[PDB]
Amino acid sequence: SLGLVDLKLFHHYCTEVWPTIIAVGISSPEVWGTYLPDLAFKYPFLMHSMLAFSATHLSRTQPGLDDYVASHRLSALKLLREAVLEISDDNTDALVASSLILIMDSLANASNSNPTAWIFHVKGAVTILTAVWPLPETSKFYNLISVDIVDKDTGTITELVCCDDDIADLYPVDLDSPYLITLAYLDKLYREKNQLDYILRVFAFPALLDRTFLTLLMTGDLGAMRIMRSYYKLLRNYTTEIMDRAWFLEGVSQVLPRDVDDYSGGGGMHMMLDFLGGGL
Amino acid sequence: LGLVDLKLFHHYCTEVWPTIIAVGISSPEVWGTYLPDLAFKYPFLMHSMLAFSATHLSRTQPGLDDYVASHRLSALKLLREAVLEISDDNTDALVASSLILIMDSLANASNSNPTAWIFHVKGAVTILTAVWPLPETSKFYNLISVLGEIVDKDTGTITELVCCDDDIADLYPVDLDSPYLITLAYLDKLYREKNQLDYILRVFAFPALLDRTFLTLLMTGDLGAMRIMRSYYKLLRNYTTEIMDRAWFLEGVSQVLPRDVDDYSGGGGMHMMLDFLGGGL
Ligand SMILES: CC(C)[C@@H](C)/C=C/[C@@H](C)[C@H]1CC[C@H]2C3=CC=C4C[C@@H](O)CC[C@]4(C)[C@H]3CC[C@]12C
Ligand SMILES: CC(C)[C@@H](C)/C=C/[C@@H](C)[C@H]1CC[C@H]2C3=CC=C4C[C@@H](O)CC[C@]4(C)[C@H]3CC[C@]12C
């Protein structure tokens, strides 16, 4: 059930929006400019994500679209949360796709805005992504990850270039460690900053933690939490440095504090819970 | 409108207008940027465009017969309502849904179609007639239009032409006092531009850009004017069959345009003329 302004919003995407996605350092003009729009006709959930996104961008020059943005994001979150209950295999790329769009769009819509609303939308997208990962290798979206150096001359990580002084206490780490996988993931992603789709790898990281680590993290374990603070230093610094490059990362410095203790919704432990957790 | 309407606007932008350019038309800026943008300001242009692209998608996807017909009449209705209040701001909107509706009508006239495609074309033509002359500032100005060189410089008369020479010998010498001079020069110049870009659109606009003197003269059934239009008809018909092989929406137009106008499925040649020319005042 749509109007004339939706045709325009979709024209605004195929026309102007997705070139800006490519421009910040994403790959595949074919997925973003061809595959997505086609999938959108099949999955209302991705369609509502795409329209909300392009109306957020249009809000930049055309006035009067604040309710489109708001209303479309909501439908997208709703349809997206309902869609996760029944995951098929033909709707998997469409979910991944709308998840990433909802992330870009929520970071763009973080005016300050509590930040509970933007955080809540991102949460949904993290739960959808967590849900569908791992992706078949058949997925055109199976380059939002990385392959997987750590451990040397004693068979236990002794040094990581990713942060080195941020997890020292943990050093050294056994191959048995539950922290191993994440640390390798995180370090390997870090030595990948000068490459295409880095922004999307950085984006997907919280959803691609192994369940062991994650279930461990939600108990508030200190090692894991220290580990994630390293991811956070990477995310925040990568984001605030490219604000001029990406229109939708603008003002992200104002919504992501330096010290997680300064989280506006509570404490660091609260800032983890607002971002992680699906809905069983 | 709904989701199909969106997929359709999307279809236009991805596959319909590149085929318009491909036939021998210039300015991709008008057909893929200017029009879509105007389509948002003017619902009559919008319906024209969704009907066109659904006609083009109809060739493969089935079930849009309803879509094609619904958007085509609605465009006519608003287009026809829109000629009563022309402005300089909606004039290119009007020109462009005229040519769209013209192409969409040629694509929808069948192996043996009736008078519906023609009805629409008549509407397109009468809009066109009402907005011409376009201001030179219009983007469509060079796209749909275009003297002494037709005259023989040693006799002072139109001793001979290309294109219609055998067809209208009886008319010769044509003096500059004649009311057939502007049309004959226009037709000769139209022939003197075939390999050039936008020829199809010049050929298309010709009936709407006759001067009123000639036209009012033609609607009285005057034999001279009329023989002349038969020359335009030989040119329109002759071009469409060769480029029917190179353009999807001119397919089967020979089945609907007879070599003898006397074989008009609706009447005599004077009826074929009346069903294409004429307006609402
Ligand atoms: C914006 C998109 C990319 C989504 C996916 C990322 C959100 C970030 C801000 C979220 C994802 C995981 C969250 C996260 C996980 C774990 C902890 C450990 C805790 O002791 C302090 C908060 C902290 C560190 C939080 C901070 C906020 C994080 C880093
Ligand atoms: C298809 C689009 C391009 C529209 C504009 C053109 C329609 C054509 C087929 C119409 C336009 C003018 C019509 C036309 C005008 C005048 C006469 C004179 C008459 O004694 C015989 C019919 C005849 C020759 C008709 C035949 C059909 C014509 C040539």
Short mmCIF file of all heavy atoms in Angstrom, two decimals, chain B residues 34-75:
data_model
loop_
_atom_site.label_atom_id
_atom_site.label_comp_id
_atom_site.label_asym_id
_atom_site.label_seq_id
_atom_site.Cartn_x
_atom_site.Cartn_y
_atom_site.Cartn_z
N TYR B 34 15.14 13.79 -17.16
CA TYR B 34 14.13 14.84 -17.25
C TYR B 34 12.72 14.29 -17.10
O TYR B 34 11.90 14.85 -16.35
CB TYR B 34 14.28 15.57 -18.59
CG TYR B 34 13.51 16.85 -18.74
CD1 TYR B 34 13.60 17.87 -17.78
CD2 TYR B 34 12.71 17.08 -19.86
CE1 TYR B 34 12.92 19.05 -17.92
CE2 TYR B 34 12.00 18.26 -20.00
CZ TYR B 34 12.13 19.25 -19.04
OH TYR B 34 11.44 20.42 -19.16
N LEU B 35 12.39 13.18 -17.79
CA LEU B 35 11.01 12.71 -17.78
C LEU B 35 10.59 12.15 -16.43
O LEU B 35 9.53 12.56 -15.93
CB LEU B 35 10.78 11.70 -18.91
CG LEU B 35 10.07 12.25 -20.15
CD1 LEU B 35 10.88 13.39 -20.72
CD2 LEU B 35 9.83 11.16 -21.23
N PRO B 36 11.37 11.29 -15.85
CA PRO B 36 11.04 10.73 -14.56
C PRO B 36 10.84 11.82 -13.55
O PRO B 36 9.95 11.73 -12.77
CB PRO B 36 12.27 9.95 -14.21
CG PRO B 36 12.80 9.52 -15.50
CD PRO B 36 12.50 10.60 -16.47
N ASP B 37 11.67 12.84 -13.58
CA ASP B 37 11.57 13.92 -12.65
C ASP B 37 10.31 14.75 -12.85
O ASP B 37 9.74 15.23 -11.91
CB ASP B 37 12.83 14.79 -12.67
CG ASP B 37 14.03 14.14 -11.97
OD1 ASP B 37 13.88 13.22 -11.19
OD2 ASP B 37 15.17 14.57 -12.18
N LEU B 38 9.87 14.89 -14.09
CA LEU B 38 8.66 15.63 -14.42
C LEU B 38 7.46 14.77 -14.11
O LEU B 38 6.41 15.21 -13.72
CB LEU B 38 8.64 15.92 -15.89
CG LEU B 38 9.31 17.17 -16.37
CD1 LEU B 38 9.37 17.15 -17.86
CD2 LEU B 38 8.48 18.33 -15.92
N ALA B 39 7.64 13.50 -14.32
CA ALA B 39 6.57 12.58 -13.97
C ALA B 39 6.11 12.73 -12.52
O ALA B 39 4.94 12.47 -12.22
CB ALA B 39 7.01 11.15 -14.25
N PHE B 40 6.99 13.16 -11.61
CA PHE B 40 6.59 13.35 -10.21
C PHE B 40 5.80 14.65 -10.01
O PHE B 40 5.03 14.77 -9.05
CB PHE B 40 7.81 13.35 -9.28
CG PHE B 40 8.77 12.22 -9.54
CD1 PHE B 40 10.10 12.48 -9.83
CD2 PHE B 40 8.36 10.90 -9.45
CE1 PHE B 40 11.00 11.43 -10.07
CE2 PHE B 40 9.25 9.86 -9.68
CZ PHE B 40 10.56 10.12 -10.00
N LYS B 41 6.01 15.63 -10.88
CA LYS B 41 5.26 16.87 -10.82
C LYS B 41 3.93 16.82 -11.55
O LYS B 41 3.10 17.72 -11.33
CB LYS B 41 6.11 18.01 -11.39
CG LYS B 41 7.26 18.40 -10.51
CD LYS B 41 8.09 19.48 -11.17
CE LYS B 41 9.19 18.90 -12.04
NZ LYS B 41 10.16 19.99 -12.37
N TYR B 42 3.70 15.83 -12.43
CA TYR B 42 2.53 15.82 -13.31
C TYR B 42 1.92 14.44 -13.49
O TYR B 42 2.44 13.62 -14.26
CB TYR B 42 2.91 16.40 -14.68
CG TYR B 42 3.30 17.83 -14.58
CD1 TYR B 42 4.63 18.22 -14.67
CD2 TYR B 42 2.34 18.80 -14.36
CE1 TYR B 42 4.98 19.53 -14.57
CE2 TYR B 42 2.69 20.11 -14.24
CZ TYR B 42 4.01 20.48 -14.35
OH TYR B 42 4.34 21.81 -14.25
N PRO B 43 0.78 14.17 -12.85
CA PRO B 43 0.20 12.81 -12.91
C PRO B 43 -0.12 12.33 -14.31
O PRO B 43 -0.02 11.13 -14.57
CB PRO B 43 -1.07 12.94 -12.06
CG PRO B 43 -0.84 14.20 -11.23
CD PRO B 43 -0.07 15.11 -12.11
N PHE B 44 -0.47 13.25 -15.24
CA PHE B 44 -0.73 12.82 -16.62
C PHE B 44 0.54 12.27 -17.25
O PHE B 44 0.50 11.28 -17.98
CB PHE B 44 -1.33 13.97 -17.45
CG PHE B 44 -0.45 15.21 -17.57
CD1 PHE B 44 0.59 15.26 -18.46
CD2 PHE B 44 -0.72 16.34 -16.80
CE1 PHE B 44 1.39 16.37 -18.55
CE2 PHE B 44 0.07 17.45 -16.90
CZ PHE B 44 1.12 17.47 -17.76
N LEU B 45 1.69 12.87 -16.96
CA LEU B 45 2.91 12.28 -17.51
C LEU B 45 3.20 10.94 -16.86
O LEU B 45 3.75 10.04 -17.51
CB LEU B 45 4.09 13.23 -17.33
CG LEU B 45 5.43 12.69 -17.79
CD1 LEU B 45 5.38 11.96 -19.15
CD2 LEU B 45 6.36 13.86 -17.86
N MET B 46 2.91 10.78 -15.57
CA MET B 46 3.15 9.55 -14.82
C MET B 46 2.38 8.36 -15.38
O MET B 46 2.95 7.36 -15.68
CB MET B 46 2.88 9.80 -13.35
CG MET B 46 3.07 8.65 -12.41
SD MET B 46 4.65 7.85 -12.48
CE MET B 46 5.64 8.95 -11.52
N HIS B 47 1.09 8.48 -15.51
CA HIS B 47 0.28 7.43 -16.14
C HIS B 47 0.78 7.08 -17.53
O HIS B 47 0.83 5.90 -17.90
CB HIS B 47 -1.17 7.87 -16.23
CG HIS B 47 -1.83 8.03 -14.90
ND1 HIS B 47 -2.49 9.18 -14.54
CD2 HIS B 47 -1.97 7.17 -13.86
CE1 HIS B 47 -2.98 9.04 -13.32
NE2 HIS B 47 -2.68 7.83 -12.89
N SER B 48 1.13 8.08 -18.33
CA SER B 48 1.70 7.79 -19.63
C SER B 48 2.90 6.87 -19.50
O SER B 48 3.03 5.91 -20.27
CB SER B 48 2.11 9.07 -20.37
OG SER B 48 0.97 9.71 -20.88
N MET B 49 3.77 7.14 -18.54
CA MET B 49 5.00 6.37 -18.42
C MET B 49 4.79 4.98 -17.84
O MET B 49 5.47 4.04 -18.26
CB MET B 49 6.02 7.16 -17.61
CG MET B 49 6.41 8.37 -18.39
SD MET B 49 7.54 9.48 -17.56
CE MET B 49 8.99 8.46 -17.34
N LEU B 50 3.84 4.81 -16.92
CA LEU B 50 3.59 3.47 -16.38
C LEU B 50 2.86 2.60 -17.38
O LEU B 50 3.00 1.37 -17.37
CB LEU B 50 2.78 3.58 -15.10
CG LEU B 50 3.57 4.25 -13.98
CD1 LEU B 50 2.64 4.61 -12.80
CD2 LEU B 50 4.69 3.34 -13.53
N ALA B 51 2.06 3.21 -18.24
CA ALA B 51 1.39 2.44 -19.27
C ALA B 51 2.39 1.97 -20.30
O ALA B 51 2.39 0.80 -20.70
CB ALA B 51 0.28 3.27 -19.91
N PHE B 52 3.26 2.88 -20.73
CA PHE B 52 4.30 2.53 -21.69
C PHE B 52 5.15 1.38 -21.17
O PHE B 52 5.26 0.34 -21.82
CB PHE B 52 5.17 3.77 -21.99
CG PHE B 52 6.02 3.62 -23.23
CD1 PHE B 52 5.51 2.96 -24.36
CD2 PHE B 52 7.33 4.10 -23.26
CE1 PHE B 52 6.28 2.80 -25.51
CE2 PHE B 52 8.11 3.96 -24.41
CZ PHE B 52 7.57 3.30 -25.54
N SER B 53 5.73 1.52 -19.98
CA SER B 53 6.64 0.49 -19.53
C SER B 53 5.90 -0.82 -19.22
O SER B 53 6.49 -1.90 -19.33
CB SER B 53 7.46 0.98 -18.33
OG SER B 53 6.82 0.73 -17.11
N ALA B 54 4.62 -0.76 -18.88
CA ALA B 54 3.88 -2.01 -18.72
C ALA B 54 3.56 -2.63 -20.07
O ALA B 54 3.47 -3.85 -20.18
CB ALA B 54 2.62 -1.79 -17.92
N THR B 55 3.39 -1.82 -21.11
CA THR B 55 3.27 -2.39 -22.45
C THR B 55 4.52 -3.16 -22.83
O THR B 55 4.43 -4.28 -23.34
CB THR B 55 3.00 -1.30 -23.46
OG1 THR B 55 1.67 -0.84 -23.27
CG2 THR B 55 3.15 -1.85 -24.83
N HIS B 56 5.68 -2.61 -22.51
CA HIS B 56 7.00 -3.21 -22.78
C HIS B 56 7.32 -4.41 -21.95
O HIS B 56 8.06 -5.26 -22.37
CB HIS B 56 8.15 -2.21 -22.60
CG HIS B 56 9.48 -2.76 -23.00
ND1 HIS B 56 10.31 -3.43 -22.14
CD2 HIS B 56 10.13 -2.73 -24.18
CE1 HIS B 56 11.39 -3.81 -22.77
NE2 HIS B 56 11.31 -3.39 -24.01
N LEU B 57 6.78 -4.46 -20.76
CA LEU B 57 6.95 -5.59 -19.89
C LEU B 57 5.92 -6.62 -20.27
O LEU B 57 6.17 -7.77 -20.10
CB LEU B 57 6.81 -5.21 -18.42
CG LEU B 57 7.89 -5.67 -17.46
CD1 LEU B 57 7.38 -5.58 -16.06
CD2 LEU B 57 8.32 -7.07 -17.76
N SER B 58 4.75 -6.19 -20.76
CA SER B 58 3.71 -7.13 -21.21
C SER B 58 4.26 -8.16 -22.19
O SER B 58 3.77 -9.29 -22.21
CB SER B 58 2.55 -6.37 -21.89
OG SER B 58 1.41 -6.26 -21.05
N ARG B 59 5.26 -7.78 -22.99
CA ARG B 59 5.81 -8.70 -23.98
C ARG B 59 6.32 -9.99 -23.33
O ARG B 59 6.24 -11.05 -23.96
CB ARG B 59 6.92 -8.02 -24.78
CG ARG B 59 6.62 -6.57 -25.17
CD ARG B 59 7.13 -6.19 -26.53
NE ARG B 59 8.56 -6.46 -26.65
CZ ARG B 59 9.15 -6.66 -27.83
NH1 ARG B 59 8.43 -6.60 -28.94
NH2 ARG B 59 10.45 -6.91 -27.90
N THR B 60 6.83 -9.93 -22.09
CA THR B 60 7.32 -11.11 -21.38
C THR B 60 6.41 -11.44 -20.20
O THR B 60 5.66 -12.41 -20.27
CB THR B 60 8.79 -10.99 -20.94
OG1 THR B 60 8.97 -9.93 -19.99
CG2 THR B 60 9.71 -10.72 -22.12
N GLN B 61 6.45 -10.68 -19.11
CA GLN B 61 5.54 -10.91 -17.99
C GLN B 61 4.09 -10.87 -18.48
O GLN B 61 3.69 -9.90 -19.14
CB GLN B 61 5.77 -9.85 -16.90
CG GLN B 61 5.81 -10.32 -15.41
CD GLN B 61 5.92 -9.12 -14.40
OE1 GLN B 61 5.04 -8.25 -14.33
NE2 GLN B 61 7.00 -9.10 -13.59
N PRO B 62 3.22 -11.77 -18.09
CA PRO B 62 1.82 -11.63 -18.49
C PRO B 62 0.97 -11.02 -17.40
O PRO B 62 1.45 -10.77 -16.34
CB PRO B 62 1.39 -13.06 -18.65
CG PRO B 62 2.19 -13.76 -17.66
CD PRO B 62 3.53 -13.16 -17.81
N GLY B 63 -0.30 -10.78 -17.68
CA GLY B 63 -1.19 -10.21 -16.70
C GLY B 63 -1.27 -8.71 -16.48
O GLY B 63 -1.85 -8.28 -15.51
N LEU B 64 -0.72 -7.91 -17.37
CA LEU B 64 -0.76 -6.48 -17.20
C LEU B 64 -1.72 -5.86 -18.13
O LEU B 64 -1.62 -4.71 -18.45
CB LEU B 64 0.61 -5.90 -17.48
CG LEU B 64 1.67 -6.49 -16.59
CD1 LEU B 64 3.03 -6.39 -17.23
CD2 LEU B 64 1.67 -5.80 -15.26
N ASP B 65 -2.50 -6.70 -18.74
CA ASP B 65 -3.35 -6.18 -19.73
C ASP B 65 -4.20 -5.17 -19.05
O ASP B 65 -4.44 -4.13 -19.59
CB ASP B 65 -4.04 -7.30 -20.43
CG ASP B 65 -3.06 -8.27 -21.02
OD1 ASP B 65 -2.06 -7.81 -21.59
OD2 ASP B 65 -3.25 -9.49 -20.91
N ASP B 66 -4.60 -5.46 -17.83
CA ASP B 66 -5.37 -4.54 -17.06
C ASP B 66 -4.56 -3.27 -16.79
O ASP B 66 -5.09 -2.19 -16.85
CB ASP B 66 -5.85 -5.22 -15.76
CG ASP B 66 -4.69 -5.67 -14.83
OD1 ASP B 66 -3.55 -5.81 -15.31
OD2 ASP B 66 -4.92 -5.90 -13.62
N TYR B 67 -3.28 -3.41 -16.51
CA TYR B 67 -2.42 -2.28 -16.21
C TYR B 67 -2.21 -1.40 -17.37
O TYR B 67 -2.21 -0.22 -17.24
CB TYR B 67 -1.08 -2.70 -15.64
CG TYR B 67 -1.20 -2.78 -14.19
CD1 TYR B 67 -1.47 -3.98 -13.56
CD2 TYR B 67 -1.18 -1.65 -13.44
CE1 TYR B 67 -1.66 -4.05 -12.21
CE2 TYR B 67 -1.37 -1.71 -12.08
CZ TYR B 67 -1.62 -2.91 -11.47
OH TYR B 67 -1.79 -2.96 -10.11
N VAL B 68 -2.03 -1.99 -18.51
CA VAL B 68 -1.83 -1.25 -19.71
C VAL B 68 -3.05 -0.40 -20.01
O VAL B 68 -2.93 0.75 -20.29
CB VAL B 68 -1.48 -2.20 -20.84
CG1 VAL B 68 -1.56 -1.51 -22.18
CG2 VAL B 68 -0.09 -2.73 -20.63
N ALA B 69 -4.22 -0.98 -19.96
CA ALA B 69 -5.43 -0.28 -20.27
C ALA B 69 -5.86 0.76 -19.29
O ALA B 69 -6.43 1.75 -19.65
CB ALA B 69 -6.55 -1.26 -20.50
N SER B 70 -5.59 0.53 -18.03
CA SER B 70 -5.96 1.46 -17.01
C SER B 70 -5.12 2.71 -17.03
O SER B 70 -5.63 3.78 -16.85
CB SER B 70 -5.84 0.81 -15.66
OG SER B 70 -6.75 1.37 -14.78
N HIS B 71 -3.84 2.57 -17.23
CA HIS B 71 -2.96 3.70 -17.23
C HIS B 71 -3.05 4.49 -18.50
O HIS B 71 -2.84 5.64 -18.47
CB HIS B 71 -1.54 3.29 -16.88
CG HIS B 71 -1.30 3.09 -15.42
ND1 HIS B 71 -1.37 4.11 -14.51
CD2 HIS B 71 -0.99 1.98 -14.72
CE1 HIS B 71 -1.13 3.64 -13.31
NE2 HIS B 71 -0.90 2.35 -13.41
N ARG B 72 -3.38 3.86 -19.60
CA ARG B 72 -3.50 4.53 -20.86
C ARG B 72 -4.70 5.48 -20.96
O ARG B 72 -4.58 6.53 -21.52
CB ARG B 72 -3.58 3.50 -21.97
CG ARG B 72 -2.34 3.31 -22.81
CD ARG B 72 -2.45 2.06 -23.70
NE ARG B 72 -3.27 2.28 -24.87
CZ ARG B 72 -2.92 3.03 -25.90
NH1 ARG B 72 -1.77 3.62 -25.93
NH2 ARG B 72 -3.74 3.18 -26.90
N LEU B 73 -5.83 5.12 -20.41
CA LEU B 73 -7.01 5.96 -20.48
C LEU B 73 -6.93 7.13 -19.53
O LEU B 73 -7.28 8.24 -19.86
CB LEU B 73 -8.25 5.13 -20.18
CG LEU B 73 -9.66 5.69 -20.34
CD1 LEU B 73 -9.72 6.79 -21.36
CD2 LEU B 73 -10.57 4.58 -20.71
N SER B 74 -6.44 6.85 -18.34
CA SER B 74 -6.22 7.82 -17.27
C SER B 74 -5.26 8.90 -17.74
O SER B 74 -5.48 10.10 -17.48
CB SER B 74 -5.68 7.12 -16.04
OG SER B 74 -6.75 6.74 -15.20
N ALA B 75 -4.21 8.51 -18.46
CA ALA B 75 -3.35 9.51 -19.05
C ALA B 75 -4.13 10.37 -20.04
O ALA B 75 -4.06 11.60 -20.00
CB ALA B 75 -2.15 8.84 -19.71
#
